[PDB]
Every structure is written in C-alpha cells, then in structure tokens.
Amino acid sequence: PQITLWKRPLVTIKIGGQLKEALLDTGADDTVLEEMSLPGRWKPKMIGGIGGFIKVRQYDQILIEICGHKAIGTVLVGPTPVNIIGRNLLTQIGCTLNF
Amino acid sequence: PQITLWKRPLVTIKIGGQLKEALLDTGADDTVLEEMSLPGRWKPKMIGGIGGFIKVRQYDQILIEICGHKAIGTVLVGPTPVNIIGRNLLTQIGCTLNF
Numbered sequence: 001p002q003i004t005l006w007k008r009p010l011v012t013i014k015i016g017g018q019l020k021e022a023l024l025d026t027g028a029d030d031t032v033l034e035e036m037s038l039p040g041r042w043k044p045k046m047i048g049g050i051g052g053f054i055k056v057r058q059y060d061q062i063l064i065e066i067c068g069h070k071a072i073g074t075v076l077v078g079p080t081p082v083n084i085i086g087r088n089l090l091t092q093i094g095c096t097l098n099f
Numbered sequence: 100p101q102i103t104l105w106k107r108p109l110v111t112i113k114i115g116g117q118l119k120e121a122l123l124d125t126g127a128d129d130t131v132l133e134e135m136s137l138p139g140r141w142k143p144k145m146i147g148g149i150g151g152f153i154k155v156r157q158y159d160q161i162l163i164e165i166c167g168h169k170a171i172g173t174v175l176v177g178p179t180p181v182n183i184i185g186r187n188l189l190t191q192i193g194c195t196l197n198f
C-alpha cells in the first residue's frame with residue numbers, strides 16, 4: 001500500500017498467533033513491543049527515545065507478520081508506550097519513504 | 100525522492116535561516132528541534148516518547164524547508180536528543196510510506 005501521514009501509520013501485526021496494532025516508525029532503529037511473552041532466550045538492550053533510556057528484552061529471529069508481509073528478525077520487548085515497527089523490520093517488508 | 104530505510108532517514112532542513120540535519124519520522128505526531136531561537140509567541144507543551152516526557156516550547160505557523168520542499172506548521176523546541184520532522188510537516192511535503 002501507499003500510506004499517507006495525516007493519521008498515525010498504524011497497521012495490524014501478527015506475532016505468536018496474536019493480532020496487535022503497531023506504528024510504522026521510520027524514526028526508530030529497532031522494533032519495540034509492549035510487554036508480552038516470546039519464546040527462547042533474550043539478551044539485554046538499553047534503547048533511547050525522547051525522555052531517556054529504557055531497558056528492554058531482546059529476542060532474535062522472531063516471526064512477525066506486518067500488514068500481511070512476513071518478517072523474521074529482532075523484536076524488543078519492554079515498557080514502551082506503543083508497539084513500534086522500526087527500520088530493522090520496515091526494510092524486510094520493502095518499506096520506503098516517498099515524496 | 101525515494102528514501103530507503105537501510106539507514107536513518109536524515110535530511111537537510113532550513114529553518115530560521117539555519118541549515119540543520121533532521122530525521123524524517125513517521126512515528127512522531129510533532130516536529131521537535133534541539134534548542135534554537137524562533138520568532139513570535141510560544142506556549143509550553145509536554146511531549147512523550149520512549150523514555151517519558153520532555154517540556155518543549157510550541158511555536159505555530161513556522162516556515163520550514165525540508166529537502167527542498169517548503170512547508171508551514173507548528174515546531175516544538177526543546178531537549179530532544181535529535182532533530183525530528185514529524186507527521187504535521189511530512190504531510191505538507193507529500194511524504195508517504197510505500198511497500
């Protein structure tokens with residue numbers, strides 16, 4: 001699709017068989033989801049936004065579908081205000097900015 | 100232009116006679132710049148991101164040139180780690196997400 005920006009670019013994602021809403025975020029290096037359960041081991045990461053840094057759990061090679069496009073990559077989990085799809089997965093689904 | 104997302108989508112902007120680098124940020128409602136002087140009246144605003152909230156000065160009807168495209172809108176000024184071009188100005192230059 002072509003997504004204009006008059007509203008927040010919110011899409012449906014599917015992860016662990018669950019549907020969630022997430023923000024397509026060109027300003028985010030990483031993908032960060034609200035607290036949830038994921039399989040396997042995790043490693044620590046500190047990520048910095050406006051306001052400061054938060055600690056998150058890093059899971060690698062996670063299956064996630066974004067607006068019907070399949071991706072497999074790193075998903076961070078922690079006290080984010082909103083589910084965020086960052087550039088690590090936007091690139092996998094072939095996202096560009098255009099004007 | 101078409102901007103891929105392998106790297107941070109940083110572009111040159113011109114604002115208040117100054118050239119600055121800023122991030123094209125579809126995950127931002129607002130445009131927020133590092134400390135600078137702007138003309139006219141302002142009012143305080145709290146904005147929230149990953150690490151909580153910061154206080155900024157809100158200036159309305161500010162002229163900005165983004166990657167060669169002129170726009171007018173509200174610009175917030177304050178302790179952001181990075182210069183951010185948010186949706187309020189991305190719409191004005193006809194910027195879309197495409198995949």
Ligand SMILES: COC(=O)N[C@H](C(=O)N[C@@H](Cc1ccccc1)[C@@H](O)CN(Cc1ccc(-c2ccccn2)cc1)NC(=O)[C@@H](NC(=O)OC)C(C)(C)C)C(C)(C)C
Pocket residue numbers: 025026027028029030031032047048049050081082084086124125126127128129130131146147148149151180181183185
């Ligand atoms: C290199 O660092 C990053 O990539 N940082 C990312 C990040 O925070 N990106 C910011 C822009 C940014 C980049 C680098 C340093 C600091 C900030 C945005 O792309 C992500 N984002 C994602 C985000 C969106 C909403 C909220 C939020 C916060 C409080 C209440 C409700 N929502 C938090 C994070 N948006 C906002 O924070 C915006 N907030 C906003 O539009 O609020 C409606 C601002 C900007 C206008 C403040 C992540 C931590 C998500 C990975």
Ligand SMILES: [Cl-]
Pocket residue numbers: 171172173187188
């Ligand atoms: Cl505006």
